[model samples]
Target chain A: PLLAAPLAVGDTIGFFSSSAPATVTAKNRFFRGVEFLQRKGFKLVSGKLTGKTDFYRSGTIKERAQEFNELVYNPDITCIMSTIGGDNSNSLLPFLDYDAIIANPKIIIGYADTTALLAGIYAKTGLITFYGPALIPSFGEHPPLVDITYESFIKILTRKQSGIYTYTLPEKWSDESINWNENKILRPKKLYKNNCAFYGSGKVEGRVIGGNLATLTGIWGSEWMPEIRNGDILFIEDSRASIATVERLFSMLKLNRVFDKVSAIILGKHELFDCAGSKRRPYEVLTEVLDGKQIPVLDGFDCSHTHPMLTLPLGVKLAIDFDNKNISITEQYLS
Target chain B: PLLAAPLAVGDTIGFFSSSAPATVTAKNRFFRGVEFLQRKGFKLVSGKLTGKTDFYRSGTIKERAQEFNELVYNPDITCIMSTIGGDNSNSLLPFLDYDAIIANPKIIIGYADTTALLAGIYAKTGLITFYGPALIPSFGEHPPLVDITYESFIKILTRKQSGIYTYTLPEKWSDESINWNENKILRPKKLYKNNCAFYGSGKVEGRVIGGNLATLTGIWGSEWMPEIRNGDILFIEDSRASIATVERLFSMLKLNRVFDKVSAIILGKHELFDCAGSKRRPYEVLTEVLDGKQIPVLDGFDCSHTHPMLTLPLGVKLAIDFDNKNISITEQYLS
Candidate 1:
């Protein structure tokens, strides 16, 4: 319904915290994130809550909503990326300036808890938003992964919004935890062999929907959550959730008849999933929940919480060629 | 609305686990619970999944759902109470025997994660269900508190399934993590002052709805979650939860226009609330989410995860008197 203008060097990107108070709490990482974007010739626009903290969040619900709205109203800020996603981003959805986003469309990007907003924005305005890295977590990281993440981000945002673009599966990815402020790496942080999966054979195409599965529950069944339509391709991811938690979320799909509606499921690699000694991957738990109801599945997609994440557009036409072992955007996401 | 005959001493009470494998892991507590109930003249019926474990849950999603259905099919099992609540109860909702419950109405009660079932059953069939004590956790407890809890449970279940009744607030309550296997007291569970408060003067009546707040999200926005209709009194409680978690849930109510719908909210006592060093109670978190909107609130009602829990029937008419500070069941739960 809404198409936003594309980004370029010198185009301003607005950064805000709707949930986590990363601006004030993680000062070193915050500054590094801003500097990372600046080095690429993009100007940084700080929202009103910048450098502010109020206990558990960046501010009160109204204050957080206002901070986001101010950015939405600013025409100069061509992209609005969250500093970091945290709990309760859904709290701002009802108060958001939906009309402003549609009137002055711009790239809206962030992942993890920010999925609450990204999916919601798409649901409400029909303006495609990037299900990708945020300012702090992705850009503030050390060299190789951050560079790769930025490459993916620019390749998506800086391009004219449109047509059949396939993703490059990164050679190395990590979910390793390290101090963000540390200037040195311990033992070069090991990378696992790429074990990406595309379960079913042949091609499946549909409008792509979904983000972090855990965050979706926050707005599930509400107006802000996009309706799971017939033939829609679902792409979901999460980080450090228990085996039980994984099962419950997957079960929600069945209860909602989402399995009956969607033609395919694109499950991202669950970063550090807690199997609770069962050692079962998120896909394994999902298969158990499926209970012999077979559907085309593509797991371990790079558009998730792991390092060197790929950016995906919500509400855009996506095609998964399982036989060819590839997933691609089939329709325009930009103006 | 469907309802059945009242419970008797000889009636069977089926105990099952849809989520956590409490029967297997807490063997002593489970048997002690059965013995406690049997000493009062009740027979015990075990679900097929009893003593079974598949990592975190009692069984797989289908197995858990079928276990609940089997209990629904059993004619002698006049009551079905969960052995204990855990993380995966919502998985059973889709596969439950809804028609069986509607055709042969019986009492189904359990708190915590069982809220998913309790609320779902009522929403699906208009059949009344109780939000009360479970087996291993509530009945297996040591001494005095267990006696008080039973007093509340029996007073509700054994009574004529209709007519108005008032609850007697227990003078003492506990949320202490007592070792259920221990036969001795743990230096007398510390009791805080009975700080139950009824904010907003005057009286209001409506159908009461809700149980463990955390469990509600698992079924939120689905047909299983009862609509927060206008004039309906919301009765929500939770066990251990973080402050951020509490805020996120409260914020959901606002986003769903729930705050604007329900006449009043009956906030139950949170058991061992982890305020995340802010020392904020659930109500405080709720008020902040309210953001200047005012609503009548009955805070710290006895029916929650706390010890000496009260049994409240969902879908029954409730009258809340703030002037005199009383909560009463004003409708017939059985017919």
Candidate 2:
């Protein structure tokens, strides 16, 4: 495993639109996120494709790769973050400059469709990429939630845990459907008390890996996807997917025999998961797919599409105490 | 490789709702398809979950598997076909009776989500499954289109190719949307003349494999997904997917180095492909993903979600004569 130096307060954070053109589409949120980081003493660099789009994506495949590669090769940038994620991040995988990423190790962080990049980068260069915040989606959120999000980000990236960090769950979380372009809405999202469930007993520890489940499918069979070894803790989440799609994704893992190998599963909260009037949750769908596999499950962990998400470093050892209902990062992710 | 005996005139065909509850949801089409097959002198046996639905799927994963397995174990059934494709077919993968499929070697056929079963059964038991029409969507279509679909199915299953069968392009095809439950619309779908493009000159020969592109993601990287070997001609298609989604799927293939290995690609006509106002076709997206890879491409093949779909047997030797603009079955698909 490889580690980048811990991010500093005055570090340069380069943001790229590897997929969505959120800088243009969600201008208000993008600027808010930018101002948030700036006020916290970090400088932000924008990728060439920021505020630009080619149809449904930020740019063409090569153009998107070039946008991200520019950040990877820039020595001044200590951390690279995605503006937001769309369905096409995997398109940039083949064109990515893995060599440059290896030459200059930097903290790569994002969630949702950005999973393609986080997992792909980890698989290619063995760098511990963070599965946490994106610019518009995480830091751009209003008030208390954004503050909590940044606190976790700073804690994971700046403060060293030194292989002894136990993640403290946020008291509240939200998956409200707020329009990203809405700039003047004073209505705060309805937050719910965290009810993350742990199914089974005792502690199950293993290397934590995986990201957004749907995005992982984009790179599932390729060399870019990290191999899910036996006893590994699979950390997976998704957003805005129907229960049927969720069933298929879970079955995809099952057919690959992932359920048979993993010691535990860390299922992140799904944002606005449509159950097609069935009232079924993502965890229930997973249980049905498991079909009696007694693997430990930490259901509804907060490192996902939901607000106030936590920072999780991929390719690091993680332990889950099902009896005590605790999830912890058991390995050092930063040098 | 294993081959099921050719379908005789009075052979019993078992129909299962492997994914969608099309039997209940599209009763008009269901009966129309049943009548179509019966008029052609074939007996139709309904699976246990024919009119049943558990939310968006036909039933629970195990129940759906049991419905299909019952047909697989039935001695009277010589062929099994799916009613329609939906998002949850892959969920039945683990519970399927692959051993019964090996013992019976019944003729199996369907498209879309059925790709999971077709590819999976072939991967597990070496039985060549047909990628052709399903019950509700294909045979239920009105008039000329459905006739052509049945003709192709019969040609591929009942008749012997003797290693020299060539598919003649259908004169017209349609992917027009219509409510399957509507029995009052007497208007026929608008059909366009077939313009299946042959993008390169000269001949390419290899084993033909692959089905619905999006559904293949469900079984991808598993024992179910057939290995995309060197020189293999890939036959891939999708339906109702956005151009962005299409790009990700293509990039998924590219990231796996599939483009570097395949001799040629058979691009199927996407049924109502959502271009997201990009106006770019699936083939165009593939071209961009190829990034100057000089491989032959047969764009807009008819074996897909579109009407008057052709029957292509998986795991068989296929030859594409680009100079002559021909796609031929060079190996026998049935005993």
Candidate 3:
């Protein structure tokens, strides 16, 4: 697997809005995120379409793609991240500068709709990209919550580990939509205890794959999508999705025989899920889709849309100890 | 190409609820459709899960698949129709009886979510499945509207066209959801004059593929989806979709290099499309994604979720006369 150098303090980070115009729509949060990162000892460079908006998305397909390509060509930018993710990131896939990405190999990271770019980049150039935090939603929060998310992000990106790196579960998590725009701490969100479950015994190891489940659908059949090889560990999550939609997405994977190929599955915590009065969870839908296929599953992992998110390097070796309920990165993601 | 026999007056059409529980949810329209078909000299047989409901779906994935498989295995069932389209039809794809369908080549028909089954059946068994109206939404409509829709259905099924058959545009059409649950026409639906646009020169001929653009995404990477070969004509449609969602779906096709393969595209009318304040249509989004890939386009055809919908047979050779603005079935779909 290809690897980028570990991120260091004082390194330059460039951000682009491939889809949503969160920089314009959520100016308050955008500034807060920028300040948070700036104070963390990193220099920031905004993309050309950072504060731009073309109604629902940041810009047209060509314009959005150019913004990302520009960042890839920048010699000073050690890492490129997304400002926010909307529905149209796949639109820029064909126009991306994959050769430049292969040559430069800067750390590419974001979650949710950013999966299109992360997965596509890895498929095209074999460069390890990240499924972690986006600017507006991840870093633009108030004090203590954003602190935990940053700790994970910095720890994973900076640590050049040769040994297995097990993840520590966050004691508390929240999927609430509060204090998003304004800086005032109106009230602390109701936090829930981490009730992540491991549904199989013993240990399983494989190369990690997958990102936002819904975003993966946009690029599923394309060459940009990474092939789910036999015994690969698939990690997927979706936010604000209905149970019916979740069932359909999972069934899509089953119909494609992903369950048969994968050694194990990692399901991230679904944020603000709507069950349509069924009261059924995403795991239940996944179980129904799996039918009688007995695959190891790690349900309700912290690397998702929820706060205090953990960073995961795609296309890297991952091991899941189901008996001990532990998930760890078993290979080096940075050199 | 595989073709089913022509439909006779006394032929039976077995209906199944693959996804939606429309028979139970829309009981008024369900009964209305049954009576309407009975008056047309056709017999109707409901699937085992006709009136069953399991919250968001008609039944579990296995149960829904069983309903369709039972109908496929029946010797007397010459045509299989879907009661309605819902989000989870792709869930039933893995469990479908493709071998039984291959042995008994029947006219399989429905629209929307039924695209998953129609496209899948055509891909698996080379059966020419129809992209047409569903039971509750088509035949259950009030007199004049339902009459036009039935005329198209019966004419296509009954006429054994040896020569080229061209489609006649309806004088008017309506997408308004009036009297859907109730039999009473609260008010006459506002109809618009046919202004379907043809945006290319001369004729383009090739095999026709594609159905419900959104539904196609669910089965895109799976073996169930037909391979979109070079020089093929793609016919796609969606209903109640946002411009953002349409952009994403269209970009999916673009990212898959579908535009480079297909000779032409027939975009069916998007019923009640939400522009998300951009006021741009689906075709506009497609044009943006096309990015100067010159291809013939037939915009706003009547074979969609609107009233007086036409039935197009998937996996059949088709020809489009853009100069004269005509779409014709060059190859026979029924024996």
Candidate 4:
């Protein structure tokens, strides 16, 4: 894998609509986000489908792939992020220009459906991608919460924090939904005091892998999926899903022998989960699928579809000291 | 691989609920199905989970497996079927008594999420399972239509069809919506003329494989999943799905390079497809994902979410004659 350059204040960051049409459908929010980033001294670039829509997605598969490739081919762009995620990003993987992306790699990042693209790029070229904030939902929020998301994005993408870059858990976070199309947040979201749990008592270090567990199923047995290796720490989260889906997904991992290999599990907060009257959370369902494997787990991390999100590198080495309640990035990402 | 004995009249056929508790939820339909099978001269056997409910499923992980094993270990039972399919069938895979099933092979069958159970049995023990009917939906169906579903199921599971046994296409079919909890169907479902399509010439021969496409992802890339080999014929179908979901699933197969290896695809009828204003059929999306690969396709086969359904044996040799428009059982299944 080739090294990607870190971003500078004046460097250009490109935004593309990989699947969703957030740029068009949420115009007020989109512009608010663009202005927010611009004020931070970063020059922004818009992909070809910035204001386009085709029924449910931004464009056809070829058009979506072309937009993404055009961003990779641009010499001035230091990073590429998604506007939002929908259901069809995997459709564009077959048409993406892997050769062009490998020759000039940039920071690629997003969550939800964008997991397909990020995971695909990592598998094909081994280049690290960020499972972090997007342009629309994160940047368009009201200032106080938006400040924390931007601050974390800056640390991961703009500088090199190679050894023992410990992460500070947020004091508060929110996953309360407000219409993104509104001119401003109609109401202040309810924030919960941080209750992130660390469930083991030993130090564990491994390469961090996995994101948007449901999206991983789209590429599960394919070449686009990064192989879940032994001793890797799995980072999984979901947006709006039922307990049934969550149970079945964990079952998929157990059947694939992932629980037998991964050193530990890290779960991000589910945005709005339907527990199906069982009152069971993800970790409890995980226990049933795990079926008594003594695997360590760290739950309720704020790195998913929640406010004050943290940006983490997908292929980098990460260390977790459960006894000390510490998490740190141990690998450098930039050239 | 081992040969399994075929069923005869008066032999007990066991039914279990791996996920959904349809037997308890729709008692009227459940008894209707049991009485229908009894009139067909088959003695009925109830799984331990019958008339039981646990939130979204029939039982807990261990409980579901226990009920299934109770049926598998019974010497009087010649066939085992599912009462219905929900999301957690894959959860039972890890706890299944596969050695007991292998030591005493039986005719196992179901559809939808039951695909998880069928494919797992095939992968684990090399047993031929049926992708036919479940108890709640098929046998509980009204007149004429139920007769066709039972007739085809009987042909595949009861008799010894040694050589070429050509399938007769049903003249009409329905995917209409109807409430199943009623003592009788509310009204006659709207029917349509058969217009099944064959998109190739000459003939192709291969071992048939595949079931409900989405359910395949639940066990994909695992020990419980059977590998898709070269020259195999794929038979995939879905019940209710959106256009974007359909595209992602086909792209998964494409990303895994399945199209380049399989001799042909046999697509079953999709029930109540929401095309998202694209008005695109499953075969059309199949072509797009195929991306200029000229693989043969036999679309609108009567063996999926729609009725009257056909019963097909998994892991057995099948022959397709495109020139004459015919499909036949060319292999044996009985001990």
**Prediction 4 global C-alpha lDDT:** 0.88
Candidate 3 chain B lDDT trough over 10 residues, lowest sum: B177-186
- What TM-score does chain B of candidate 2 reach? 0.98
Q: Which residues of candidate 3, in runs, are more than 4 Å off?
A: none
Output the chain A TM-score of model 4. Answer: 0.98
Q: Flag the better candidate by DockQ, 1 or 3.
A: 3
lDDT of each: 0.86, 0.90, 0.91, 0.88
Model 1, residue B206: what's the lDDT? Answer: 94
Instruction: Kindly indicate the candidate among 3 and 4 with the higher DockQ.
Output: 3
lDDT of 2 by residue, B1-335 (tens): 89988888899999999887989889998998999999999999999998887878888888999999999899999889989999888888878999888888889999999999999888889899999889899988888788999888888888865558899899999888974668766687888999899999999999998999899999999988888899899999999889889999999999989998999999999889998888899989999999999989999999998888999999999999999999999988888
List the lowest-lDDT window of 10 residues for candidate 4 chain B.
B156-165
Task: Give the DockQ of candidate 3.
Answer: 0.82
**Preferred candidate (lDDT higher): 1 or 2:** 2
Worst 10 residues of 4 chain A by lDDT: A155-164
Model 3: docking quality category: high
Instruction: Give the Å error, residue B203, model 2.
Output: 1.2
Candidate order by lDDT, decreasing, is 3, 2, 4, 1
Error of 4 at B250 (Å): 0.6
Model 1 accuracy (lDDT, Cα): 0.86
TM-score of chain A of 2: 0.98
